[PDB]
């Protein structure tokens, strides 16, 4: 093979993180994070951020519609653009002779975008197909219901615009957004497959804007609660979650550890999942097809976890219980050291793979970078799984257990059950 | 700039649905209009030598036969092309019949005018060369208006322009010859743009609306193939027996002086002028000679069978063939002389050609559906 | 100078039908010639000989020509 | 939709579908 | 007896021969074509193939073997009750503007 | 009231591609200009039609210049005669049908530009009523002038039998006998009323081996298309 | 109407094959001339009585038009 | 390959090349047609027509 | 450090062999995971009209413990160690494989072995996976994409094997017993019709003791006539119309016959089925997409799906396209791209290929990134190609197709090609063959 | 299942060099395409030679009859 090198970093002036893996491969992948997610749309400005999506390759300063749509595929590149409830990812892909080309384009992009009313108002009902064909997979509503129901000023915004706000989010809203949200001390620069001097040197001379952040979120103070859509689907879908621990702390880990402790997903296809904790204990009362997981949500300000029920019809009333009663044998304190140096296994090469193709590594790396300071490699990632002990384990257990509760439910939902009767 | 807009109104022409079971019945229409096109083509080439005057109208028709180059072709595919043109059209209306596409009121309706003009058109065509039988012909056919009382002997040489059969109506015979073509071309497009309102029947007489193909390439290839036996058939007729359907004395000029022996109308006309001459009653000839032809728009208020197509109806398919043949009958009696026993065939046929379509026919149709308990 | 068809017609008159309606015609020409003041004439008779005649000699006259 | 195998972070670009992790 | 010529007459009309039932030749009308729209999808979809499979036939101008032949015994009247029907609401609909 | 109809004499021509025999033509000619010319008219026929038929130019014109035919008016507007050309058409025996009768007992000899297409039977008829001529059968008396031909109408023909033997004598000296001289006035009768003839039943077998050959190639063409319907298979599939 | 809005079709499947991968005339003969008879004793008893009836009529009607145009018959008539 | 198969690239393949082919093969049948079914038609009425007795009149 | 340069820096996988057959794999990187497994040639094309869908029954019963590991250890054994466990069958390949720690590679090759040659076959867990296919039969019924696919097989090589779906035809899944699922197994899994495939983390020569130590002990050579010969597939140009209406929308696929996993056509019809490109309404680009299909069928909306192929097999192949959309659009959706087709055959203009090669070159570099797709890649190539191929090799092929290559190329394939049809929905509108054949030529 | 459905059996009415379902059609294609294809050319040459000969008669039509060419000389 050839030489592994060092991550570079560096940390300009204004707070604004720039990286660059140099692992000579064919292709450059660069990435543009931004603080930027539906946390910081207020209640008024719904949507804002949805659209903002769509809306690359919308005409910009230096580069029209056209240029930017119909250049990019004269190589062969990519423009993608990925959000969480928390952060913007511009993220573009070429060969690694075009790198200035998709470099440029994505600098306008996110520097100088325009939002022309015309433009503006032509892209709108994209908002209506791109939800629309998201909520296809009926864990979308389940899961956006959960946190509005769980948090209330920041996270409970949708990753989806409102359908009264479809049609009604301005130019003026996306230039007011993007000047106070795209800036320096919001703003990691992530480079793979290219040299640090390039990217130092354009991240100086053309990223430089205010760096001010010109909205701050809130602290997403917790609510908690329940939201039940009955919709009659032929399943029900139901999650159940409690209030865990915010990602950056050694607390965060023993929850991490928790859920490959219950249930991960497969890892043998076809399979009967015959360690996961959750399926095991709702597999023997209830005789029937049925899934659970646990749900594991961990941001900077906050964090979820818990667990989803894909249960019948008539099996929700049993499955979302008895696999309840099976968490509560967790804080209760039923673990042994097999069962955490399992998970501890799991999450070890869990994490291992998830950042082995170059499209994982670069969304950890500005995830690091935007989230706190600097790259930590995967060693202390993976030290940082063992040094969580047994405790640990159980008392993220006794917090879920004794907890504030969220649960949101959707499908025929005559026998499913309440906070107060689980 | 490409005038490629109103091309796409051959939506219905190509990708029309057709149904997928239309048999050579169907096929007729279009040849009507080779026909038509054919003949309005051959006599604006005849009309540049003819000429509709008394002194000189045999004589030019000569002329284009022996001295214009290759006169004589055109002058009997023309001649036989409108024979073509009547087989076509009694064929085509036949399948209507048969197949109760009559339902389809104004298609029908409009075709019943057609008809009409068609008869109309060929009747003049066949005055304008001035032969014994092409006088005489006239001086028969169209005095029968003066049967009608009152009015008729006014209106009859009002016709003419004067007392008799002259110069003064074969001019203006070949003037409205050369014009109604035209019209029949206009009400042709009319009868089409009803018809595409519904689509075609189909021999089943049930909607075809569950399996249909595009006109083209399908009913295109059928139809030129359909032209080019057509095109056979005329081609025979001119190159081969070019007088078969023609009567001789109209190859002696017309004189008003002399008689001829056997004065019959063009075959095509026979089977009514049988019919006229079952009635001794001169204004009854006319009035059953009438009715001998609209009673086709009658015949959809007849309609009877639950059933559309005759496809599925044994009384009425006989009965049916009894009418066609009931009219070779005619047809033949039209072409003797008034003698035994010919008048008293006559009489009978006559008879049976109404009975069957007015009294018969919708009564087959009627027992027919006691039997199937409709 | 002698005509073929003068031949043709001695020849085909010998057949039986043309010398069966010749019979005919004598027979009733008699009839018609030996009476008083009668109206008819054997000329269908003349004519029914001559059709049979003249088929034949249609047959074969335009061999000598 | 299928059934039967059972046992956030949205996503849109420019030429890709949407993802939603 | 009449059910020997009505059995003889329903063989001879032929429509057996293609694989149609009655109530598929119907003359298409006001009434049939609302008796039809009523049809459940079931009764409605068989007879939707039953003419696709009769019109193909003809077009190639043959028919079935003896043996698929529809039956008199057997041939379902399935259109009659709901026509029947809505004749009769027509006919109070008349009555009444009398 | 009774009619005797012609038989079926088989002409060289009569055959559906068999043409006229030019030769018999000409000879047919010389018994129009020699026999009938002096009462038949035959108005719609020319010297210059003669020409690459049955005669060659330069005979033609010597035919043509054979007779005196009038023109002018000349300088002093009179009209005065010259002797034929090319293009005159074939003189009028007499000047009006009047004249015509009253030269001959009131009948009026028709013109033979298209008698052959103008009477049902055609030379079959022309052959037998020249040569048909016969006595009037014991019953039988006729007005004076009046001649009985029994494949005439009425059998009462006002024309003289018009051919006996060597009535004339022909340029190839064929032997001139009745039947022989009507054989071939009837060859040209024909070409005068129909002289397409020849051509036109040439076309015909180029028409026939035509459609010959396309009609299956087109009908080919119809089966190639419509292979993909009358082929097909259909397959109802409800569920449940 | 066209293709597209002509009516409701569920449950069916046609199979269809090229024209350059199938033969133009199959089985001609083969198939052909049976179908053809069949085809023609189907029909023949509607459609060929009510021509045979022409034919008859035809005939009688002219050949008694010919007789009745000939002569008389007593051998003796047209005197005593 | 078959006559049919090289016909088909070498002339049907290409519609420039297909047309011109039926035009140069209509003009090579037509002169074909012609004087065949002339020669067939001259020779079934063999002695009868005016380019047969022409050469006796000058 | 160019792009040229950046294809010499790639680790040359290094490929072994045994006496006994088996071909060994590998492609070292740094990757502290890595990517093992089992690639054999076997399938629904091999199979048979009376064993068909037992290459599906196998897969599915693999997992369900071996003898050296009976009931549900195999799963937990690999389910514990974290690793991950996959398998998959098509008409022409079957594969098994393990996302692993590089560590774990030794434990990890063991256990393929174990799944591949001692495999249970419960006669009690036949009857478990009989009542689980039968269910897997009834999802794929309603996935108009998958059932359109299997049309288009079916009807584009009708009478032949290839015709047959991997999944097989509902009466053999309720009637196969575990005589013909053994038989199957031990007359198909050989092992020189076997590739052991890996990449990650590891030294090709520690996979390779690994398969003299498990392996070795497999089948090791074959019998005379009974390991079979693959009989040509006979592609037929035919349409397979499904007309359902009370679907949302008509699902289509055209192809002709493609050249095979064999041609080197294959990377200028990769090029040419570039420039037509592929398209969802989802897609930013809209109207402004270089592939004038793309862009025609965004404003228009023609179309809410549609995406070209080129479907490889061993001596043919399918490569057409295939869309979604709406009851009256399917003649222009099919209009546009015949066109553009026969625009491809008879005029190519020189950029817009060097679009097509660049969007390829793209697709390729960031196809074989991770090890999961780099392992499958080694897995297959041995399978079909008989090597591995250079990226440093594909980008040679791929710099000589130019717009003179493209046109000889897909003129050859395209102009005047009977296509075969599967069409699913409301597809009253759906063209009749004869008008899509004369889509097929040129100079209307 | 829609795996069921297998195509029926057109060996009935198929060409003999599309015959063998082991046998690449490739070969074949090329002479089954000329041999149709050939249909239509002939087809047209025919046409064009009827066409060709129809038009001209009715163009010589207007040219100068032999009645008017009489006195030219
Ligand atoms: C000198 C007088 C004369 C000559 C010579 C003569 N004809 Fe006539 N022809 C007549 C007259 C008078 C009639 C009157 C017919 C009638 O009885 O009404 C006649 C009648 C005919 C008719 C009868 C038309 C019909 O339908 O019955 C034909 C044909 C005819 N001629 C042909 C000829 C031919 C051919 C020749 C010589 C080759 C010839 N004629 C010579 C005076 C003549
Ligand atoms: C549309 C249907 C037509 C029919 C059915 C028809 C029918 C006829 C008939 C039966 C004749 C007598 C032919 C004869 O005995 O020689 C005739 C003559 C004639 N027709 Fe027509 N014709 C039609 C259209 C036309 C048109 C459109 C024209 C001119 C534009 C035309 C011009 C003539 C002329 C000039 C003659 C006299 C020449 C002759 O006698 O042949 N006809 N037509
Ligand atoms: C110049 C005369 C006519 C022309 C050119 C003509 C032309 C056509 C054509 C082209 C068609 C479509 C093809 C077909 O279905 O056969 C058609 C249909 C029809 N015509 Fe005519 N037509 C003429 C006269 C008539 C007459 C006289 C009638 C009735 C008395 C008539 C009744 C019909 C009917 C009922 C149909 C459609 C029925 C079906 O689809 O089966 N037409 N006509
Ligand atoms: C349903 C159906 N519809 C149509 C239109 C046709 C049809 C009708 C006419 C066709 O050719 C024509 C020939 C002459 C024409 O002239 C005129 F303008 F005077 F008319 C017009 C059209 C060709 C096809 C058909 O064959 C069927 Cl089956």
Known sequence: ?422 | ?374 | ?65 | ?21 | WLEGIRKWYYNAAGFNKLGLMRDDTIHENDDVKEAIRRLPENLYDDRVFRIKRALDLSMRQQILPKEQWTKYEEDKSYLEPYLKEVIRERKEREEWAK | ?240 | ?80 | ?58 | ATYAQALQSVPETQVSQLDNGLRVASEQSSQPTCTVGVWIDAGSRYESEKNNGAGYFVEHLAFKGTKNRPGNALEKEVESMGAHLNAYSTREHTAYYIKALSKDLPKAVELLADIVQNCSLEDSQIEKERDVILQELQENDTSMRDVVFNYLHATAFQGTPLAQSVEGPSENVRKLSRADLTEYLSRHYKAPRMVLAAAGGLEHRQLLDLAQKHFSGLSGTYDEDAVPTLSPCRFTGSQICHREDGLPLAHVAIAVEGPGWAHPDNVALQVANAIIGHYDCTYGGGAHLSSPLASIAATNKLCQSFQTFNICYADTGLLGAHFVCDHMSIDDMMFVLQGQWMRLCTSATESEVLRGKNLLRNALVSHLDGTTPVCEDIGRSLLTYGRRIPLAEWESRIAEVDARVVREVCSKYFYDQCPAVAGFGPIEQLPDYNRIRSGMFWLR
């Open chain 3, 1 to 65: 100078l002698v005509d073929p068809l003068t031949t043709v017609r001695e020849q085909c008159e010998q057949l039986e039908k043309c010398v069966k309606a010749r019979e005919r015609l004598e027979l009733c020409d008699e009839r018609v010639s030996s009476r008083s003041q009668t109206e008819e004439d054997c000329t269908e008779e003349l004519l029914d000989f001559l059709h049979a005649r003249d088929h034949c000699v249609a047959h074969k006259l335009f061999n000598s020509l």
């Open chain 7, 1 to 80: 109407r066209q293709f597209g809005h002509l009516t409701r079709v569920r449950h069916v499947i046609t199979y269809s094959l090229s024209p350059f991968e199938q033969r133009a005339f199959p089985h001609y003969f083969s198939k052909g001339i049976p179908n053809v008879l069949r085809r023609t004793r189907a029909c023949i008893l509607r459609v060929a009585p009510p021509f045979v009836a022409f034919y008859l009529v035809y005939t009688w009607g002219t050949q008694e038009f010919e007789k009745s145009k000939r002569k008389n018959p007593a051998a003796y008539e047209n005197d005593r």
């Open chain 6, 1 to 240: 009231d009774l009619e005797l109809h012609p038989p079926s004499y088989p002409w060289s021509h009569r055959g559906l591609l068999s043409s006229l025999d030019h030769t018999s033509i000409r000879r047919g000619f010389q018994v129009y200009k020699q026999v009938c010319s002096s009462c038949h008219s035959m108005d719609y026929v020319a010297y210059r039609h003669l020409v690459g038929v049955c005669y060659t130019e330069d005979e033609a014109k010597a035919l043509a210049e054979e007779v005196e035919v009038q023109d002018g008016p000349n300088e002093d507007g009179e009209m005065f005669m010259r002797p034929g050309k090319l293009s005159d058409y074939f003189p009028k025996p007499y000047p009006n049908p009047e004249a015509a009768r009253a030269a001959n007992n009131g009948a009026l000899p028709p013109d033979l530009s298209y008698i052959v297409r103008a009477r049902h039977g055609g030379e079959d008829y022309v052959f037998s009523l020249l040569t048909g001529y016969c006595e009037p059968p014991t019953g039988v008396s006729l007005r004076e002038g009046l001649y009985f031909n029994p494949y005439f109408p009425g059998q009462a023909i006002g024309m003289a039998p018009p051919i006996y033997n060597e009535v004339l004598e022909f340029d190839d000296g064929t032997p001139a006998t009745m039947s022989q001289v009507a054989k071939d006035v009837c060859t040209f009768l024909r070409w005068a009323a129909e002289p397409e003839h020849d051509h036109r039943k040439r076309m015909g077998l180029k028409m026939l081996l035509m459609m010959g050959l396309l009609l299956p190639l087109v009908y080919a063409m119809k089966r190639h298309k419509w292979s993909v319907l009358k082929s097909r298979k259909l397959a109802y599939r409800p569920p449940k």
């Open chain 1, 1 to 422: 093979p050839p030489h592994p090198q060092d991550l570079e970093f560096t940390r300009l002036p204004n707070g604004l993180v720039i990286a660059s893996l140099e692992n000579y491969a064919p292709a450059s992948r660069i990435g543009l994070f931004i603080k930027a997610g539906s946390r910081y749309e207020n209640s008024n400005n719904l949507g804002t951020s949805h659209l903002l999506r769509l809306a690359s390759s919308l005409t910009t300063k230096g580069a029209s519609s056209f240029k930017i749509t119909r250049g990019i595929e004269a190589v062969g590149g990519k423009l993608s653009v990925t959000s969480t409830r928390e952060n913007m990812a511009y993220t573009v892909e070429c060969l690694r002779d075009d790198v200035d080309i998709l470099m440029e384009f994505l600098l306008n992009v996110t520097t100088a975008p325009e939002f022309r009313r015309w433009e503006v108002a032509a892209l709108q009902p994209q908002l209506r197909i791109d939800k629309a064909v998201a909520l296809q997979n009926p864990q979308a509503h389940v899961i956006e219901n959960l946190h509005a129901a769980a948090y209330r000023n920041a996270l409970a915004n949708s990753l989806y615009c409102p359908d009264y706000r479809i049609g009604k989010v301005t130019p003026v809203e996306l230039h007011d957004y993007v000047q106070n949200h795209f800036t320096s001390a919001r703003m990691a620069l992530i480079g793979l497959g290219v040299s640090h001097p390039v990217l130092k040197q354009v991240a100086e001379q053309f990223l430089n804007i205010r760096g001010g952040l010109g909205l701050s979120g809130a602290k997403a103070k917790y609510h908690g609660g329940e939201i039940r859509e009955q919709n009659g689907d032929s399943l029900v879908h139901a999650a159940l979650v409690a209030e865990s621990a915010a990602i950056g702390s050694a607390e965060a880990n023993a929850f991490s550890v928790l859920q490959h402790v219950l249930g991960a997903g497969p890892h043998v296809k076809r399979g009967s999942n015959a360690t996961s904790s959750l399926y095991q204990a709702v597999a023997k009362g209830v005789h029937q097809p049925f899934d659970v997981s646990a749900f594991n949500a961990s941001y900077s300000d906050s964090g979820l976890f818990g667990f989803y029920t894909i249960s019948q019809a008539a099996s929700a009333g049993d499955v979302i219980k008895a696999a309840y009663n099976q968490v509560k044998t967790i804080a209760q304190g039923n673990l042994s050291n097999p069962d955490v140096q399992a998970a501890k296994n799991k999450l070890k090469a869990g994490y291992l793979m998830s950042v082995e193709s170059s499209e994982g590594f670069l969304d950890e790396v500005g995830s690091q970078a935007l989230a706190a300071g600097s790259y930590t490699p995967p060693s202390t990632v993976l030290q940082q799984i063992d040094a969580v002990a047994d405790a640990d384990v159980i008392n993220a257990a006794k917090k879920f257990v004794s907890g504030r509760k969220s649960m949101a439910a959707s499908g025929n939902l005559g026998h499913t059950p309440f906070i107060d009767e689980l």
């Open chain 8, 1 to 58: 390959p078959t006559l049919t198969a090289r016909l088909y690239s070498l002339l049907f393949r290409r519609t420039s090349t297909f047309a011109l082919t039926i035009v140069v093969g209509a003009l090579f049948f037509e002169r074909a047609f012609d004087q065949g079914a002339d020669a067939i038609y001259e020779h079934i009425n063999e002695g009868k027509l005016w380019k047969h007795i022409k050469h006796k009149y000058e």
């Open chain 4, 1 to 21: 939709l299928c059934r039967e195998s059972l046992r956030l972070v949205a996503s849109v670009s420019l030429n890709v579908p949407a993802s939603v992790r």
């Open chain 2, 1 to 374: 700039k490409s005038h490629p807009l109103m091309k796409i109104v051959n939506n219905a022409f190509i990708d029309l649905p057709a149904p997928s079971n239309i048999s050579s019945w169907w096929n007729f229409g279009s040849l009507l209009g080779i026909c038509l096109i054919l003949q309005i083509l051959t006599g604006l080439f005849l009309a540049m030598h003819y000429t509709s005057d008394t002194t000189t109208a045999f004589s030019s028709v000569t002329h284009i036969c022996r001295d214009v180059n290759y006169g004589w072709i055109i002058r009997y595919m023309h001649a036989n092309g409108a024979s073509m043109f009547f087989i076509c059209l009694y064929m085509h209306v036949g399948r209507g019949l048969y197949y109760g596409s009559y339902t389809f009121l104004e298609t029908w309706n409009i075709g019943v005018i057609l008809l009409l003009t068609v008869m109309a058109t060929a009747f003049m065509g066949y005055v304008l060369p001035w032969g014994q039988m092409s006088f005489w012909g006239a001086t028969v056919i169209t005095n029968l208006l003066s049967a009608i009382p009152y009015i008729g002997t006014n209106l009859v040489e009002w016709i003419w322009g004067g007392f008799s059969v002259d110069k003064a109506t074969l001019t203006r015979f070949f003037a409205f010859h050369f014009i109604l073509p035209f019209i029949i071309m206009a009400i042709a497009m009319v009868h089409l743009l009803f018809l595409h309102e519904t689509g075609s029947n189909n021999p089943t007489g049930i909607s075809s609306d569950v399996d249909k193909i595009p006109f083209h390439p399908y009913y295109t290839i059928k139809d030129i193939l359909g032209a080019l036996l057509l095109i056979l058939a005329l081609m025979l007729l001119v190159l081969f027996a070019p007088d078969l359907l023609g009567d001789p004395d109209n190859y002696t000029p017309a004189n008003p002086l002399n008689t001829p022996p056997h004065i019959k109308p063009e075959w095509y006309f026979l089977f009514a002028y049988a019919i006229l001459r079952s009635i001794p009653n001169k204004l009854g000839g006319v009035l059953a000679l009438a009715f001998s032809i609209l009673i086709l728009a009658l015949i959809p208020l007849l309609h009877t069978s639950k059933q559309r197509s005759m496809m599925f109806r044994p009384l009425s398919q006989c009965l049916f063939w009894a009418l066609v043949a009931d009219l070779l009958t005619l047809t033949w009696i039209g072409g003797q002389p008034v003698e035994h026993p010919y008048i008293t065939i006559g009489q009978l046929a006559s008879v049976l050609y109404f009975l069957l379509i007015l009294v018969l026919m919708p009564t087959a149709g009627t027992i027919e559906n006691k039997l199937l308990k409709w």
